Structure 1
Amino acid sequence: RKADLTGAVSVVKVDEIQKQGENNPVKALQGRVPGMNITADGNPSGSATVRIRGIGTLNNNDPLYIIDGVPTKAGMHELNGNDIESIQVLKDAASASIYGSRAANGVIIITTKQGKKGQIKINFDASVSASMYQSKMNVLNTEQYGRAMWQAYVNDGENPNGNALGYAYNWGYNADGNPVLYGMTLSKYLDSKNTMPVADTDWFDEITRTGVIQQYNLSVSNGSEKGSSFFSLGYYKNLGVIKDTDFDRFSARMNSDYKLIDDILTIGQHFTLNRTSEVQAPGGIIETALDIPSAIPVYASDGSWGGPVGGWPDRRNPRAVLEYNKDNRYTYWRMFGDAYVNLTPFKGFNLRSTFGLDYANKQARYFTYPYQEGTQTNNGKSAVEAKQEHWTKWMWNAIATYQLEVGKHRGDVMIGMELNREDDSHFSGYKEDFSILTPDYMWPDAGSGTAQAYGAGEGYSLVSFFGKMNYSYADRYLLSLTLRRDGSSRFGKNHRYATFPSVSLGWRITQENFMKELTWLDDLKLRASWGQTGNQEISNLARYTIYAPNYGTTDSFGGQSYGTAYDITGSNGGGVLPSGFKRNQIGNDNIKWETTTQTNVGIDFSLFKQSLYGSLEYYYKKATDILTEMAGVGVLGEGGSRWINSGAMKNQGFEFNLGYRNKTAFGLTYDLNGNISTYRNEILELPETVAANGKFGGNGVKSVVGHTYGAQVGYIADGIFKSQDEVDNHATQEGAAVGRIRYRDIDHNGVIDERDQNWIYDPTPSFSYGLNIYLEYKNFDLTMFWQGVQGVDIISDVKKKSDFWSASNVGFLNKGTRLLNAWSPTNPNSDIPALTRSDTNNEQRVSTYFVENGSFLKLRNIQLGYTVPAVISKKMRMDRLRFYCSAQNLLTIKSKNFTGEDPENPNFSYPIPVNITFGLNIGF
């Protein structure tokens, strides 16, 4: 049962959602909804990025979740998703407009479990899972690193014995004169102090482990004619594959409703409390682990943490970083409550007053221990940072609804007034100069150094007046008209309020009398919708020219703190220096709402006695007057960024969902759910400065206007130079040599320069598809979900340090194993460029070499279960007893062009592990 019946509505089967056993219900529906992209890195929390109907705006694209009628934008990883009864996604502007003013990026409706009338039930779910690392990046060992360094040295013509890294090479020349390596030897200690012995260390294995996930839920519901109630307690814990990273969550949900005065009066409430404690991996931990060479031992001779010495590259120990970061635990309390009252003066009139509250508390204590890893140290810096953050959102809604059933005409008229208020604040203290260096002793009162205080606050408000009218004729013709008047505190008084209309039409062809003989065609409906929605998801202080007294107490990297504090006297400090103000941004009083117009056409069909159902959708989204933050022209200096309505986004998309469920003669019930979606995005208008800096694409070389959002311009790599004759024949370029990347001459001017660039990267897949198979046979239920993406290109940063030697910010870094298969006179059948120590050809530039085919098809979740027969369960008095074993991310298929692994996450972010889970469900 769709709650709109005339728009693009996707209903998610919650039974399959809980089968995957994911903490975040959103992450479970990664590819089960057409026109919906869910990206998850794989960290222990269920945090993920959601994109509905592609990218339709230049500001934040987070969709507006709605739970029990309360809107929000926070992630669902911090909420208990196991007590969800129904999930509805509103991807159409006309359908989602009536649910709030923040429906620009789509609306997701989440309904919590409630006690069913006339029965009382309980459900206890237990789940234990083991997570194993699968995308183990292959890196060179000590011998492989030495061989690669020797190959680079001999390719560059330098003496390999002058590496000054403890490597002694016994090598010679073959008959053809190509250098050949016979053997290598290493000094026992990398330094002259004999404190860092050489060893073969698997850093990826050292920093990874086998995580343990435990989930325990207990829900009880009780219904009655005078009311109903529901109480759920949930516990979740996930240990990440990366060491010293974990996330656990307690959840308590209480829902109830009461009917008084012979069903005239109703009072209901839905409340939930969550407590999530998490230790997160440090930024770029995978990058640090990959960069550090395997020759560095984990522990030194004296038992201290190992580190680079002498000429080894300046890379911190990933194991020591994880050990020091294990105490950076943050606690998050989530408060999601709602109380509603409903009154019915007569049969057709309803008045609902609803109050919703969302209170978020975050407390963190970050520690900075003194470390000395060889030549890497922080000069004995020890510090503590105690941070507190508060978020408070409250919403009040007044709804008046009238329904009439006169003749064959059904008419619903609803009006509503909504008020939203959000207030955010944060404050933190910083202390230094500790002695014991333990979490127990590291408190700000126990410090003896410089102390700093930080603190900020902000907020906004929303006012909405909405009206919805629905007309139904003969249960065959449906018309919907809605109007919205929305205002926000982020705009000036002149442009505070804006009006948004939406219209929807629907015709049930199967109800027409001219096809009564079509018994096979059970149902057929054609619907169209044209709607307008408003977007204002911008900075709260957007229309004000912001001047702030940035003294310079905030930590900055590279010294570009831009603080305002100068020793005008010239006493080299010693006190409070004079301060001032700096401009953060230039205000603009002409900013207004961003108008997104959505046109949707849908065909819903159901054939063979409601067995073969499906829907086909075509949508066109056009966003104009987009509030974009343009940067300064260059001479305007600091604070030149300002918000302006100079954007234009276009999205043309197709979606197709199909489902076929049927039994079998011998007792097998098979249900197949197929889904496919495609979309095309385009940028039509953009400010000149934004197109020049290329923040939305183009890399600052060409304007992204007229091209897909996120498209990147780069060079074209036409293979590599296999001979000097090839170098001479090709157009002249800087750094051209044998074994180097050959760049195509686009304009045929005879020289390779900055103008030989074209559009090479397009982050738009050809189509994303999903397939869910459910089989029931003799109390055995098997679930199998496949998700695939075809026609998508990906930029691989791992390739930059796996296909080249010394292609990073620093040299002598550890590289990938496939680097051993580089081009050489001995091995001419290779496409990887020859190893070198100097990047004369400048191979770090953006080109088609780093663009790979991201197409993949992976088994997201497979589950085999056994249900106890009813007679045994009744003998044990149990209503239901089930067991199941599942595998998540067990198998995947990638393209041959993709040289790396894990096409979903081809970057240095958190890896995606394989989960093996065993679970039980009891229905006492």
Structure 2
Amino acid sequence: GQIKINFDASVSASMYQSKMNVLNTEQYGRAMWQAYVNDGENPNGNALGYAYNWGYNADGNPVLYGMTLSKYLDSKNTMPVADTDWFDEITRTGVIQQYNLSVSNGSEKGSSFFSLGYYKNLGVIKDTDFDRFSARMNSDYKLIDDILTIGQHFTLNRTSEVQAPGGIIETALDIPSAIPVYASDGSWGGPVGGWPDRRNPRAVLEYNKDNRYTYWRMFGDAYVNLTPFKGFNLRSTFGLDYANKQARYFTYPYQEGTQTNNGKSAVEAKQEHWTKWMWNAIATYQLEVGKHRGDVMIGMELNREDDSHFSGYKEDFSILTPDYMWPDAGSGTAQAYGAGEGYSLVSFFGKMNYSYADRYLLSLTLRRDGSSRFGKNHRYATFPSVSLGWRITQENFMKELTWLDDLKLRASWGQTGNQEISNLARYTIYAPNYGTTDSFGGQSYGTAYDITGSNGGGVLPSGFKRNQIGNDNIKWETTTQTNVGIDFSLFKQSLYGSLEYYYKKATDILTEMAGVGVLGEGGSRWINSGAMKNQGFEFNLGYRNKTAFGLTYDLNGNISTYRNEILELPETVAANGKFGGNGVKSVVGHTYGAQVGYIADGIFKSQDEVDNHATQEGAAVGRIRYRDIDHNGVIDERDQNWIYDPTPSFSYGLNIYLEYKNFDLTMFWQGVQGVDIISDVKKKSDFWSASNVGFLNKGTRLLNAWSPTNPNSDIPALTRSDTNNEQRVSTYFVENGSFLKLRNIQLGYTVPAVISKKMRMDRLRFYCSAQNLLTIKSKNFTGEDPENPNFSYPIPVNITFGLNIGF
């Protein structure tokens, strides 16, 4: 019988703390010089306009005395030489702001709830942004007071956003610092001459800045609940989730140095729809007879989702503005795209709960799930569970232990299914694919051909191509799971804890698996392939207690270990290497994702060390010496072994909570100890040449590369050629990825009601919080963030200020 009102608001800041340091224009000039003289080549013959003052020292070893650079990169003086920091140029402080206002009404014969919210992100990446209006409104109505009840939930979201382009950050670390942001006039800068065929990342963002989608989503449900006698309940629910995304993606002409669009201009008007509806019926019966308590429940749930998308594309526009650029206004050619897919799910289920004397618990569970992603012959799968419970401390013989409030012992066994696969997983798919979609450097795989020799100017004849081969025998991936647990609490709920042991084993694992080469186009197949096992230990422990000095602490920890192992694999998949082993060793009996590769044994420091080692092709002074695993006297494809295991030795987490003088302080720490990580980062930071495209910007670790002048370094000598195949899977790319970081720290003041209800307001609280602030890494880790070792940039820190006023 109340009416309650909450209002929450906050503003957040997001700032990139660090990044992979990449070479500046002089360091880039120094590095290329070193890679030149390391190869006995005239460094003054470079294609990039650097002029080097150098010579030989007293021991006859290249030393760089000085270097000059043109004012402009090109003879025509349209592009000036720069020292651009591209990462700082395309990033900025993100700012987030949220406001939520809620109201609820409690009444004898019903209830109703209402929320309005707003959320605006100006992303850390320039020319991006995001906003979400939201409204939720729910209610219930007690007819036939307490035997027939009707209700509803509903929410409604409008979202609009300009997403960044994929890989925008990495391409900013890739483009050299000599290229300026702006040309000699005010146009967008770019590469001239031999500089990399990579466009201006800032200019790419500006050209992206108008590509904004508008996303509308509603989802709710309506239900009736019939209670015909004391313990019985019939409930039916109908659900609906309809969203639609709309956007225009604008293509504008560009011509920035050698980069060019010709004069292309186009617009694509994209539309997407997703409608998902759900229905269930459920019958539950509870009953209590002195000691015995029992609950039964049966149900059913039909699910459907229908998807569809489609677009219109058209080229050539007189006026390069969003106002002008609609398909009606284009004068060049047009393409029309679009398709749809869908899936349906039937679900039958039941449960049975029983408890003798709040001392012995037992629960049973049974579920048939059916899914249109399989043929009739595997459409349904049935999954049971048994869960068992013994509350020791309730037992009579446990009377004597007063320092033990609870000691529960649970043991479970259950199966669940995996079904997340393509909606066409089971089909051999032939698509017409005439060749109307963009694609890079070729690779249309179009079926249209000028069979007459016309040279075009019309509809070509065309046909069909294969996208995948079907599977008449594709079935559910089944996971059988077993865990036994011991949770407890001692003293007077001051020392709570739990010790669990789980053993999950997956069977008939589902993967889209590619095909063999000679089978050719569209050989990919959706298959059930082998079995995995994952068993481990979890052990959470807590300590909560006040100090009677004004302080409450509540310290909650968690440490876990797990080991993982593949058990069976079709012979073809094991040599393929999908699950690990890199195509040289089968990963059966090893952990999922473990890798075989060469072992990097340092750097040859003398020619004698080259001759004194098994013969290997690129072996030379300054190169990486790779180990002769089998001792045959040559380094070839067999000189590989297991060199990477993703299994951490353990993973932990500790949560500190303090209340004192109405202040409150919270810290969330999470750690991972003794874990291999594997990365390509080092191919950009440690090599001038470990890359298919030349003259890209590289990391700053290069300037400590190996040299006669610099003889005791892990980093191989700079070179313009990867003759030694140092891009080979090797321990050079495996690093100690152990870490410990503060996910969140947060301090808040709760305003005492003596002063807050001043304002006819119950609660009023201010909080300040910070995410991803601190990280402690291994010394021999050389990346940015060990938890995400593939990235050359970290997660940005967030500072937030907020209030939770509450009437």
TM-score between both structures, scaled by the size of structure 1: 0.85
Counterparts of 1:652-667 in structure 2 under 5 Å?
Answer: 652-667=535-550
Q: Hey, what does 2:637 align to over in structure 1?
A: 754
CA distance in 2, matches of 1:629, 1:138: 38
Q: CA shift at 1:681, angstroms?
A: 2.1
**Rg larger in 1 or in 2?**
2
CA contact (8 A) 1:631 1:689 kept: no
CA contact (8 A) 2:20 2:792 kept: no
CA contact (8 A) 1:286 1:908 kept: no
Q: CA shift at 1:331, angstroms?
A: 2.0
CA contact (8 A) 2:538 2:560 kept: yes
CA contact (8 A) 1:264 1:344 kept: yes
Q: From the superposition, tell whether residues 145 and 644 of structure 1 become closer, same or farther in structure 2 (CA, over 3 Å).
A: closer
CA distance in 2, matches of 1:132, 1:847: 35
CA contact (8 A) 1:284 1:908 kept: no
Q: CA shift at 1:256, angstroms?
A: 1.6
Kindly provide the CA deviation profile for residues 764-808 of structure 1, in whole angstroms up to 9, marking residues without a partner as x: 222221111111100111111111122222222221111111221
Kindly provide the CA deviation profile for residues 586-615 of structure 1, in whole angstroms up to 9, marking residues without a partner as x: 322222222211111111111122222121
Q: Hey, what does 1:383 align to over in structure 2?
A: 266
Kindly provide the CA deviation profile for residues 671-711 of structure 1, in whole angstroms up to 9, marking residues without a partner as x: 11112222222222233443333233333333333322222
Q: From the superposition, tell whether residues 838 and 645 of structure 1 become closer, same or farther in structure 2 (CA, over 3 Å).
A: closer
Q: From the superposition, tell whether residues 696 and 434 of structure 1 become closer, same or farther in structure 2 (CA, over 3 Å).
A: farther
Q: From the superposition, tell whether residues 400 and 684 of structure 1 become closer, same or farther in structure 2 (CA, over 3 Å).
A: same
Is residue 194 of structure 1 aligned with residue 41 of structure 2?
Answer: no
Q: CA shift at 1:826, angstroms?
A: 1.7
Q: From the superposition, tell whether residues 136 and 632 of structure 1 become closer, same or farther in structure 2 (CA, over 3 Å).
A: closer
1:398 aligned to which of 277, 281, 292: 281
CA contact (8 A) 2:469 2:522 kept: yes
Q: CA shift at 1:910, angstroms?
A: 6.8
Q: Which runs of 4+ in 1 moved over 6 A?
A: none
CA contact (8 A) 2:240 2:277 kept: yes
Worse overlay, 484-493 or 853-862: 484-493
Is residue 767 of structure 1 aligned with residue 650 of structure 2?
Answer: yes
CA distance in 2, matches of 1:910, 1:804: 19
Q: CA shift at 1:841, angstroms?
A: 1.0
Q: From the superposition, tell whether residues 782 and 469 of structure 1 become closer, same or farther in structure 2 (CA, over 3 Å).
A: same
CA distance in 2, matches of 1:279, 1:698: 41
CA distance in 2, matches of 1:181, 1:532: 68
CA contact (8 A) 2:19 2:793 kept: no
Q: CA shift at 1:909, angstroms?
A: 7.2
Q: From the superposition, tell whether residues 699 and 275 of structure 1 become closer, same or farther in structure 2 (CA, over 3 Å).
A: farther
Q: CA shift at 1:161, angstroms?
A: 0.9
CA distance in 1, matches of 2:312, 2:572: 38
CA contact (8 A) 2:20 2:793 kept: no
Give 3-state SS (helix, strand or coil) of 1:844's partner. coil
Give 3-state SS (helix, strand or coil) of 2:755's partner. helix
Give 3-state SS (helix, strand or coil) of 1:494's partner. helix
Worse overlay, 596-605 or 805-814: 805-814
Kindly provide the CA deviation profile for residues 478-498 of structure 1, in whole angstroms up to 9, marking residues without a partner as x: 111111122222222233222
CA distance in 2, matches of 1:778, 1:275: 42
Q: CA shift at 1:746, angstroms?
A: 0.8
Q: Hey, what does 1:260 align to over in structure 2?
A: 143
Give 3-state SS (helix, strand or coil) of 1:699's partner. coil
CA contact (8 A) 2:783 2:792 kept: no
Give 3-state SS (helix, strand or coil) of 2:376's partner. coil
CA distance in 2, matches of 1:434, 1:688: 56
Q: CA shift at 1:391, angstroms?
A: 0.9
Q: From the superposition, tell whether residues 121 and 854 of structure 1 become closer, same or farther in structure 2 (CA, over 3 Å).
A: same
Give 3-state SS (helix, strand or coil) of 2:75's partner. coil
Give 3-state SS (helix, strand or coil) of 1:290's partner. helix
Q: From the superposition, tell whether residues 444 and 703 of structure 1 become closer, same or farther in structure 2 (CA, over 3 Å).
A: farther
CA contact (8 A) 2:784 2:794 kept: no
CA distance in 2, matches of 1:414, 1:549: 49
Give 3-state SS (helix, strand or coil) of 2:727's partner. coil
Q: How many residues align?
A: 807
Q: Which structure has the higher relative contact order (CA within 8 Å, separation 6+)?
A: 1
Q: Hey, what does 2:785 align to over in structure 1?
A: 902
Kindly provide the CA deviation profile for residues 121-147 of structure 1, in whole angstroms up to 9, marking residues without a partner as x: 111111112211112221111111111
Give 3-state SS (helix, strand or coil) of 1:638's partner. coil
Q: Hey, what does 1:494 align to over in structure 2?
A: 377
CA distance in 1, matches of 2:544, 2:431: 63
Give 3-state SS (helix, strand or coil) of 2:377's partner. coil
Q: CA shift at 1:200, angstroms?
A: 1.2
Give 3-state SS (helix, strand or coil) of 1:434's partner. coil
CA distance in 1, matches of 2:263, 2:574: 45
CA distance in 1, matches of 2:316, 2:256: 20
CA contact (8 A) 1:631 1:690 kept: no
Q: CA shift at 1:622, angstroms?
A: 1.3
Q: From the superposition, tell whether residues 689 and 450 of structure 1 become closer, same or farther in structure 2 (CA, over 3 Å).
A: farther
Q: From the superposition, tell whether residues 694 and 379 of structure 1 become closer, same or farther in structure 2 (CA, over 3 Å).
A: farther
Q: From the superposition, tell whether residues 910 and 241 of structure 1 become closer, same or farther in structure 2 (CA, over 3 Å).
A: farther
CA contact (8 A) 2:3 2:105 kept: yes
CA contact (8 A) 2:109 2:145 kept: no
Quick one: percent identity of the two aligned structures? 100
Q: CA shift at 1:561, angstroms?
A: 1.9
Q: CA shift at 1:877, angstroms?
A: 2.4
Give 3-state SS (helix, strand or coil) of 1:730's partner. coil
Gapped regions of structure 2 (runs ≥ 5): none
CA contact (8 A) 1:284 1:909 kept: no
Counterparts of 1:205-224 in structure 2 under 5 Å?
Answer: 205-224=88-107
CA distance in 2, matches of 1:574, 1:701: 50
CA distance in 2, matches of 1:831, 1:909: 20
Worse overlay, 864-873 or 206-215: 864-873
Gapped regions of structure 1 (runs ≥ 5): 1-117
Give 3-state SS (helix, strand or coil) of 2:702's partner. helix
Q: CA shift at 1:364, angstroms?
A: 2.1
TM-score between both structures, scaled by the size of structure 2: 0.97
CA distance in 1, matches of 2:158, 2:789: 32
Q: CA shift at 1:911, angstroms?
A: 4.3
CA contact (8 A) 2:218 2:242 kept: yes
Give 3-state SS (helix, strand or coil) of 1:262's partner. helix
